[PDB]
Amino acid sequence: PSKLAVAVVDSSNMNRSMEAHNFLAKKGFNVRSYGTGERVKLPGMAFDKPNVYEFGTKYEDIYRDLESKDKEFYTQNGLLHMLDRNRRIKKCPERFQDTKEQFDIIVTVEERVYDLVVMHMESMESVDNRPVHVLNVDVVNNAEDALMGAFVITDMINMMAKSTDLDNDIDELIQEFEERRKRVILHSVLFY
């Protein structure tokens, strides 16, 4: 129950960001989630040619679409299980490049997403001159690793929420968190 505005960003806003969104919302954080990809991309029947949707498509509609295609296979892998949690959290997956929302902390789940977030915020001229900490926490794109990743991200945000002056303590906090968790956390500052 801090006043930190937090965003978790991945590629599709389907697996990794929603897993983190779920646990952070339960912890009482002001949390939002987005995807950096051009379109929403879910895995399919085999390698390549997967399920593609436009950003703004309801999770409910994606659930019903995968249900009509193959209700049995998409239950066995667990994509319908995943789509059920997302519809409970929010209406549809959102794109980071299109949001006008402002945050204190932006967490990306892989270096490629980090680059896309940082490129986008730099492409826009500063108005409020308000800084935002952009952090990278590597999360492998699978159900098991998205779950473990969501615990690491909740952990990191909780440690940051405890600080009385996040700006003045963040570099030391990351450094100690990196050491304890045997992780590399890229950290940059961007402006609104």
Partner: protein, 332 residues
């Protein structure tokens, strides 16, 4: 012609302003958001006679209330900039605030406030005493924030670096190589009829602030966040004002050859990733023509491929190239 809209709006805010003196800090912030929405929006004419009601709350004990007052004054300088001499004192005073969260919010607000304030004072044909005194406070705000690059709080230093970036950009001349930006204002937009200040003195100050930013960028015990912020601010200055291109390319070259020993491995990667992005941005500027090979060299050191770098260089006709090549030989 008349209507009931103004009187109905005035009665709605008279109530809200009366509630403030007896309201809780949470209620005070809720009331102020409604007062701002009407007095600076729905019924903009009411703004002047409800100013002292809002500005008095700058002395309030709650930091959130003080921060709401900052957001109000910032909005005033955007929509009713003629009221700047009546709100600018509060800004300078709130830069002495004990709360770091308040100081940061004031520094952020000063970005648009200084730009709007400089634009308005320039436009005046016969500037009064109110104008001279508003400019004096604006001059003191620049000096106050300039001192904050040595503040003990990292957040305050980050905000101060960002403020100083906009001042350099405003207090220099744009040229044909300057990146095309919609609301861009330079010393070229400052008239000769202006008695309040001299173009040459503002240019001198801009150059001194740049020299301070270049010097700050090269220290051995700078934090990773302040270093990444200073690097992107130096990049914005060079793409907006390519007269500073050579100096910024030199500072980037020196940084890549000597990373502060205070940086962790993770911080070095973060700094180098941001530096790589700033160099890509500058290489796209036509004014970086002379420094293209130096930039390329740094981009190769930072892992860019020959073809990634090559695609960034703007296409130039041989006549434009010869104009530039001769000017570079002339200047030396």
């Amino acid at each position: 012609m008349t209507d009931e809209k103004t009187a109905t709006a005035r009665a709605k805010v008279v109530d809200w302003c009366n509630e403030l003196v007896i309201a809780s800090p949470s209620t005070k912030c809720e009331l102020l958001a409604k007062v701002q929405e009407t007095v600076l929006g729905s019924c903009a004419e009411l703004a002047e006679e409800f100013l002292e009601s809002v500005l008095s709350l700058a002395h309030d004990s709650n930091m959130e209330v003080r921060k709401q007052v900052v957001a109000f004054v910032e909005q005033v300088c955007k929509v009713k900039v003629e009221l700047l001499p009546h709100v600018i004192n509060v800004v300078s005073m709130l830069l002495r605030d004990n709360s770091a969260q308040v100081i940061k919010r004031v520094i952020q607000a000063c970005g648009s406030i200084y730009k709007n304030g400089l634009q308005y004072l320039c436009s005046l044909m016969e500037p009064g005493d109110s104008a001279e005194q508003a400019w004096n406070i604006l001059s003191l705000i620049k000096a106050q924030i300039l001192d904050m690059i040595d503040n003990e709080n990292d957040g305050i230093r980050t905000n101060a670096i960002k403020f100083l970036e906009g001042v350099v950009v405003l207090q220099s001349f744009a040229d044909e190589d300057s990146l095309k930006r919609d609301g861009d204002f330079s010393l070229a937009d400052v008239p000769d009829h202006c008695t309040l200040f001299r173009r040459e003195k503002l240019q001198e100050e801009g150059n001194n602030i740049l020299d301070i930013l270049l010097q700050f960028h090269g220290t051995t015990h700078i934090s990773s966040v302040n270093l990444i912020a200073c690097t992107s601010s130096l990049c914005t200055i060079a793409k907006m004002r390519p007269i500073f291109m050579g100096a910024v390319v030199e500072a980037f070259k020196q940084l890549n050859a000597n990373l502060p020993p205070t940086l962790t491995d993770s911080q070095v990667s973060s700094v180098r990733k941001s530096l790589k992005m700033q160099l890509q941005t500058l290489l796209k500027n036509r004014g970086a023509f002379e420094f293209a090979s130096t930039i390329r060299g740094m981009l190769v050191d930072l892992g860019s491929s020959t073809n990634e770098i090559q695609k960034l260089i703007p296409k130039m006709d041989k006549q434009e190239m010869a104009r530039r090549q001769k000017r570079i030989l002339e200047n030396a």
